[PDB]
Amino acid sequence: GTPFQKAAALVDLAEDGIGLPVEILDQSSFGESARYYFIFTRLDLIWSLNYFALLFLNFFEQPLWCEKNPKPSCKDRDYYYLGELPYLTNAESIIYEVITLAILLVHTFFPISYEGSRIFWTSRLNLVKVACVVILFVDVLVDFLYLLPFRIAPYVRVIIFILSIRELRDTLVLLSGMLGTYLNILALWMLFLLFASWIAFVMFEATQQGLTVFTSYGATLYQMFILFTTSNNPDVWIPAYKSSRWSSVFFVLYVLIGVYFVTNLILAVVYDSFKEQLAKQVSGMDQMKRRMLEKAFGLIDSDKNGEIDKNQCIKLFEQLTNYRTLPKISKEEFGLIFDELDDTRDFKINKDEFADLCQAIALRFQKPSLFEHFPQIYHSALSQQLRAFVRSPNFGYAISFILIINFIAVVVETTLAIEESSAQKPWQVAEFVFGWIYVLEMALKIYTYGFENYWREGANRFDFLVTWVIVIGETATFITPDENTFFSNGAWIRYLLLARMLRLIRLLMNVQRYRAFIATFITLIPSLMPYLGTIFCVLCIYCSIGVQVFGGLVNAGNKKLFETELAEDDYLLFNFNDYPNGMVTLFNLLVMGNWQVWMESYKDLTGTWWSITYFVSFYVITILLLLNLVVAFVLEAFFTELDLEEE
Amino acid sequence: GTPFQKAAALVDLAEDGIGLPVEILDQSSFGESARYYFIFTRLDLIWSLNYFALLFLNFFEQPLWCEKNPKPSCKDRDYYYLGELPYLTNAESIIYEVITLAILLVHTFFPISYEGSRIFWTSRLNLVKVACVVILFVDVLVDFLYLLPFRIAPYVRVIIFILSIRELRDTLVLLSGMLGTYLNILALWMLFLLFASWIAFVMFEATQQGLTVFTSYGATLYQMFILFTTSNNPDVWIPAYKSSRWSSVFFVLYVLIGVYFVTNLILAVVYDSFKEQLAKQVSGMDQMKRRMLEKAFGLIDSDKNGEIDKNQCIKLFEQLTNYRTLPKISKEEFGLIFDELDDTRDFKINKDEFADLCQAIALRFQKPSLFEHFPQIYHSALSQQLRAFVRSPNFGYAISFILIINFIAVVVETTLAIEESSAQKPWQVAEFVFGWIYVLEMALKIYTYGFENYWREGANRFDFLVTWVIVIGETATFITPDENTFFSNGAWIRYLLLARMLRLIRLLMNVQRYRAFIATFITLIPSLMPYLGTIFCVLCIYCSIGVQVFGGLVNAGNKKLFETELAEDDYLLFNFNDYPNGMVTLFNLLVMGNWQVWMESYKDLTGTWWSITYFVSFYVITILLLLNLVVAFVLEAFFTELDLEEE
């Protein structure tokens, strides 16, 4: 047991909670565990692809109501308002499930090799993983034997995907703590709805608005709930306004208080409670991080001198460079990290000074040209003029001028979109020239800045990709002037025109005051993914429930469907017949635009009032809790960055 | 010229920028100005009532399109979908205008008495006031002579009302300061809209969604703006979804990015700019206050010793107690404030120590019973038992039990809302007893805590007034069992139930966590008044413009009206025919619920595309600027209070 290997393992554990068990580093036969751990970590791309394949299977499964015998077979894609995604047959679904299940089974039960026996079977996460895998295997076996109330696999495989990502696991734990305070503010919100309905039920008792809308307290409470979202504001109290113009005062007060006071109060409480959960998690994670780093320091210094020498600190680096979960470190970066690590400036790292290792590792990002091989070409009299001009401030001025000319060429080309293909070639030739100029621009930039220096920053790598993607398509259209099924097609021409448009957005980066706002938007999406992924997983669960409950009520032969608001508004294509169909239907309810049409219509098709619990719970869980959390993220991101420049 | 009088005037100026001119305190004949200033300030209630009456005249004026000769006379209130507020005849309008104009003219030109001659005519605010008064007088004279393109008096009197209140003027100044940054963010929003519209127009060129919705670039931009409002989300791209389910991805991306990113960025920018404006205004006002207080202190101390004695300070107190714009101060409050002001504890107030006078004045609010006159009654064994019981914690428990019994009685009474008046008498008697026992509670509370100590708090006064208002109504209903036109009416019974339900709301204060939120809302309402008044004035201006432009297009005989979205949705009662009608029509656009129905319909009635400039500018000015500001205020208040409790 080499102490440096254990120190590297402890550093890997300190970077994030994922790693080797703590109690096996000093245990005998540790290398046999490290080897299997490295082998397991070499296949993380395969594991992630398998998990995404399991997640994306719900989109391609035949709906459960098709497993029965409807009067027309559901291959009639127009009768049920289905569309555009194929269904997997029995053989295809069976083989896909078998392959994915085998890979998942290998992934789940492999940690037992480097975790021993008792440690694997005493972890709650491993226990729930094994339980989910066993449930999925039993479901697959039952399905194979049949070829049953309902198919439970869709829910299970979504759960497996959620717990397979560390960020998705963390979000659910945080939401668990919020559940106490969130339920508290829902009771206050519920009391406001309950009493406001009581006032409106007795006020409009014998009036015209109580004989058609507020027929009973349940009807009143139902209508006052929708009014709280301002989805039917003028519609609901037309009869009250037609019989008395003073009745509008009550509804004006209710909407104003409901929207500005109550709705904003929920957002403030949700964000405040969630922000408290970060403090508990971050402090706990950081406290664990420093404990692991401190323990690693003790292993390295067996002499108890208190500090590590230069070579000993270096020897740690090549031991921790075998891990793929740690930032890449070069050979010359070894001194760079040690130079930056030293805070007391004594050629030695201290115990409390060593606790800033993980932050130090991924902070260097610096440092030399391959065009310096021949000094008779690069160092020329005319070369300096080119070198001066490319680095001159007018270089951007010239490129901006070219972009403006390109902008003029694009807008005039889009104007002649109804003309035939006879006059499109002259503009194609002009666009052909514009493609190579930008390639010439980026190639010239490589000649001056170098190759490796040109590739260091991540933003330029995106510019490298988009420049090459658009030029190969542009030149492919020109080198093939005869008729083709891939270059003269209407779809290909449209894609070409869009590509040049997304090139023109670069002009918007010239405005510094606008460029800052775009940069904030770009840097926010990576940090918003775990919360956006949770919303996607919640939609997946709700989509599976919607298909199983509201399966085939929207047909071309239903009689009660054409009397509902769904048919009158021509929303028949937004149903819960498919998984893709229900995935975009839940997006329409996500934005709360005409959202009560589906809630009203599916209540009539099911014929029961219990069906509205599907939509009420979706609004409460997703709109009020998850979307309000995402909204609060965008505000806090802008508020901190905006105030930063004035400081 | 008594120096204490000038010191009191300077303190009045320090409290707020409204007061006597600075350069007349040392000028000769100062008392002749102070007397007129006090006389002017004694009539502030009359001035405020006159200003509010002038503002409220727009609601009672006959619309200008009625001044012409429509085919039916507009006394037929149903033909034009008018309703419920009377029109002032020529004589009534003339006399009301004369009275208001006379009072306003007296108010405007009275300051010239205590401001001299040259000072009055060199102030920009006074010049604007005089110009507005002259314009209003000219309009009144022209109207009298006639009995003309249009009447300008509505806008002028709205402006007069706006500039007659300091808070509205401050809000306007801050908005003028913000205008540049608001335009800066609007330009980026417009660029985003234009780019998205270009992409959508080109990409759906020859598709079914481009032959019915995106017919041209202007129509595409219009529909993309409405979609950014998310008022027609599923409707706009139904043809695209019907021809290709993958087309929904573009619209999903547009809606998500637009709404979240752009809306929250605009809100953040507006809030940041307004906070900067608040910082500037507060800094300037505080600097002016300190300068005025320093000048007053310099005036008081003519001996240049550096500190003021006690008697001189008390003399300042009863010299400044003559102003009605300053907080009330009693006799012992003189010594109380003198003791509280002393920070160095030396029986003397210092130069910088005196600058904390305005804050100290309205901070005492303390300090004794009138029931102590007879010690043979108040001091008794049973009296002691009652005093112990009322102040005991079980007093609240018993009152809560009584209120719960009242809740049961009220709910069972409301259950039998369809029954006749024969069985309502027992419940009327029960609620009669409830009202009297509540009055007994209030009287006993007065008896135990005293009279003045009971009247010190404000919520206690509110409880007193509401209890008396409900009990007088209950007893008036009970003592008249025979048929009456005021006590057996259904409206009276409904009012009684509504009054009782608020008493039933008193129980909501028992929950501490809900009581904190309610108190936060209650203390938030006063601080939001200037912004709500600014929104109200903007709504008044827009209503006047809408009545002037969209006057009588909504009739019962129009042919192009029944083909519009206004008639199909049965929104015909929400038009711009009246001032009351337009005032509630603008509220429907305020909440952005089905808001494009009016924008679509009036474009067809006017027959021009310029009419949408009325609705777009309303959305930009009101929804994106003022309502966002109110929302930001609510969020920041809730956040600060919340974070205050965990601290």
Ligand SMILES: [Ca+2]
């Ligand atoms: Ca790790």
Ligand SMILES: [Ca+2]
């Ligand atoms: Ca050492």
Ligand SMILES: [Ca+2]
């Ligand atoms: Ca050191």
Ligand SMILES: [Ca+2]
């Ligand atoms: Ca004053």
Ligand SMILES: [Ca+2]
């Ligand atoms: Ca003195």
Ligand SMILES: [Ca+2]
């Ligand atoms: Ca002192």
